[PDB]
Amino acid sequence: GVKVERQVFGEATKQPGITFIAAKFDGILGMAYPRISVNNVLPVFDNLMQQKLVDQNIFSFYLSRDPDAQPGGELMLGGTDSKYYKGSLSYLNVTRKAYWQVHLDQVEVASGLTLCKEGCEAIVDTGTSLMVGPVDEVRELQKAIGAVPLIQGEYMIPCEKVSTLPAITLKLGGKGYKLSPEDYTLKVSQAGKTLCLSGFMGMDIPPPSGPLWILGDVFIGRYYTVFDRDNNRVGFAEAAR
Amino acid sequence: GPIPEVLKNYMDAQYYGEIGIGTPPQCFTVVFDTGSSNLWVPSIHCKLLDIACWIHHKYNSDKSSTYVKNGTSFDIHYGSGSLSGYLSQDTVSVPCQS
Ligand SMILES: CC(C)[C@@H]1NC(=O)C[C@H](O)[C@H](Cc2ccc3ccccc3c2)NC(=O)CCCCCCCCCCCNC1=O
Ligand SMILES: CC(C)[C@@H]1NC(=O)C[C@H](O)[C@H](Cc2ccc3ccccc3c2)NC(=O)CCCCCCCCCCCNC1=O
Numbered sequence A: 001g002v003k004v005e006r007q008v009f010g011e012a013t014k015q016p017g018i019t020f021i022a023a024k025f026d027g028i029l030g031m032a033y034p035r036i037s038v039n040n041v042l043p044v045f046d047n048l049m050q051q052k053l054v055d056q057n058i059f060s061f062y063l064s065r066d067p068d069a070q071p072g073g074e075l076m077l078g079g080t081d082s083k084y085y086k087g088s089l090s091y092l093n094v095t096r097k098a099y100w101q102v103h104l105d106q107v108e109v110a111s112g113l114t115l116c117k118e119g120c121e122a123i124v125d126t127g128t129s130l131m132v133g134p135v136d137e138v139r140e141l142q143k144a145i146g147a148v149p150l151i152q153g154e155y156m157i158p159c160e161k162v163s164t165l166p167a168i169t170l171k172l173g174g175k176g177y178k179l180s181p182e183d184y185t186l187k188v189s190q191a192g193k194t195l196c197l198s199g200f201m202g203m204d205i206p207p208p209s210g211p212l213w214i215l216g217d218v219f220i221g222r223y224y225t226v227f228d229r230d231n232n233r234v235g236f237a238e239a240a241r
Numbered sequence B: 001g002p003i004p005e006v007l008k009n010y011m012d013a014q015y016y017g018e019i020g021i022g023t024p025p026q027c028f029t030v031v032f033d034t035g036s037s038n039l040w041v042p043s044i045h046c047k048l049l050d051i052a053c054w055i056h057h058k059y060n061s062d063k064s065s066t067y068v069k070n071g072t073s074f075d076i077h078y079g080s081g082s083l084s085g086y087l088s089q090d091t092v093s094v095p096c097q098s
């Protein structure tokens, strides 16, 4: 293990709204850049680098995409873990050091719809479960695959339709990152019912930060992700499958 | 070397692992979130109105020999919700117990 000394953190006393009540986690440990730290508090990983508690200032995520799998995933501080990926890593420069933001070259539905046609900006966010894109472009996407709107930019797909959906490929660093329908759709469950949620949600993030696409857990689950603060880059390799 | 932090997966929607804050460590589950930059956990001094606090782990600074007070108020707004409280300083262990 590791002990990061002299870490400034929040003792939460109010959490209005409902989203924290039934969440599985007690809290959040942010791993983006200091630029977006509330009150300019030096982040855990920055404090870790300054205390030289790892040799490589990088950190990596494997996230399992079978919900019943053990382990559920792994965060490797200061390294990458070969157990969880196949082949070699391909890297992209960070474009704005705030979020882990990268240039996205395009998004292509295999049946021909192209979004982000001339390139756009994306963030690589382990704390977002779904892929996120602008409302209008996601609406077109969802129409191309036959999904229907649910609520708050989410969409559902009949489960029996999934296996025949088109693949969706994101282009990053000039390489194609394919997502099969099984990759980009999720089982959801409530009160004994099972349904299939589309893994793309529509949300407009206003300027000056936005617009931004988000590469969430849908993406990171298929592509093991390395976050490199030494070289301000993000790496992807195909995850164990 | 590299430190492994195993994570749990809930429903392909929430991924989280255990950390410690304090001496000795008080354990908490957290999202390791590449879309934000702050650490926080629920306080034992959370308001009675904070229903989420009732069923989550609470940091008690009185039980930590490494705690250093700060007290500056903070507010954070995420896409999926908001919260506020006050800052503190302590030792953070990853994992909670290694
Ligand atoms: C409302 C918050 C607190 C939290 N939302 C999410 O977890 C977001 C997720 O994307 C979830 C994943 C999700 C999506 C669609 C579902 C449909 C049917 C059953 C369960 C579903 C779960 N999205 C929503 O909650 C949007 C509202 C879904 C309305 C139908 C089910 C309502 C009862 C279960 C809601 C479980 N959701 C949550 O715990
Ligand atoms: C930097 C902090 C202050 C914060 N970060 C996030 O909101 C993203 C993060 O990954 C968080 C991590 C997070 C935090 C609280 C949660 C509470 C309940 C359930 C999931 C949660 C996930 N991801 C989301 O909120 C889900 C999708 C939001 C992505 C849109 C970001 C739009 C900008 C929101 C207003 C400015 N705030 C932020 O960007």
Ligand SMILES: *[C@@H]1O[C@H](CO)[C@@H](O[C@@H]2O[C@H](CO)[C@@H](O)[C@H](O)[C@H]2NC(C)=O)[C@H](O)[C@H]1NC(C)=O
Residues within 6 Å of the ligand: A008, A039, A040, A041, A042, B069, B070, B071, B072, B087
């Ligand atoms: C609350 O914590 C902050 C850090 O998050 C303290 O401010 C830092 O303290 C040292 C020395 O006082 C400086 O070198 C840093 O540059 C400060 N940074 C920032 C962003 O404030 C702050 O003093 C603490 N406050 C109290 C009242 O304890």
Ligand SMILES: *[C@@H]1O[C@H](CO)[C@@H](O)[C@H](O)[C@H]1NC(C)=O
Residues within 6 Å of the ligand: A093, A231
């Ligand atoms: C990426 O970043 C490094 C260091 O900032 C720089 O030397 C390199 O030219 C950049 N690569 C590309 C493809 O822009």
